[PDB]
Amino acid sequence: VINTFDGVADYLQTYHKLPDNYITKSEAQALGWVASKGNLADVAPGKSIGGDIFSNREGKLPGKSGRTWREADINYTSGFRNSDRILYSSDWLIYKTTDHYQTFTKIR
Ligand SMILES: [Zn+2]
C-alpha cells in the first residue's frame, strides 16, 4: 500500500495518477461506506479515499486558468478518516495539509 506523503507525491508526479489503493468518495459509498460509522476498512479493505475534485473556494491554494485541484487521504489504515490530505493540481504542484484543510504547505 502506498499511503504516505512522500510515497503518494512521488507516485503522482511520475505516473500522473493515484496508486491502486485509492477509491473516490462515490465509489466508497456505493460499496457500503457510511462516514458516521467509521467503516471504510471493513467494506473496502486496503482502500483509502482519494481522487475527488477539491473546490479551492477559500482561494488558499494558488489559482490559475485551467488549473484543477484534487485531494487524497494520507496515512489512513482503519477507522474514521484522519486530518491528513495531499492536494495535487492538474499541473503537478503538490501541497499537504494536516489540519483538515485549514493550512497548506508545498511539498513538491
Ligand atoms: Zn502521464
Curated annotation (Swiss-Prot):
KW Hydrolase (keyword) present: yes
Keywords: Endonuclease, Genetically modified food, Hydrolase, Nuclease, Secreted, Signal
Active site location: E71, H100
GO molecular function, one term: RNA endonuclease activity
Major localization listed first in the record, in broad terms: secreted
The protein's Enzyme Commission number: 3.1.27.-
Subcellular locations according to the entry: Secreted
Chain ranges passing through the membrane: none
Biotechnology: Introduced by genetic manipulation and expressed in male sterile maize and rape by Plant Genetic Systems and in radicchio rosso by Bejo Zaden. Barnase expressed in transgenic plants will specifically destroy the tissue(s) where it is expressed. After cell transformation, protein expression and plant regeneration, the active nuclease destroys the pollen producing organs thus rendering the plant sterile.
GO CC, alphabetical: extracellular region
Family affiliation: Belongs to the ribonuclease N1/T1 family.
Function: Hydrolyzes phosphodiester bonds in RNA, poly- and oligoribonucleotides resulting in 3'-nucleoside monophosphates via 2',3'-cyclophosphate intermediates.
Entry protein name: Ribonuclease
Organism: Bacillus amyloliquefaciens
Lineage per the UniProt record: Bacteria, Bacillati, Bacillota, Bacilli, Bacillales
Full protein: residues contained: 50 to 157 of 157
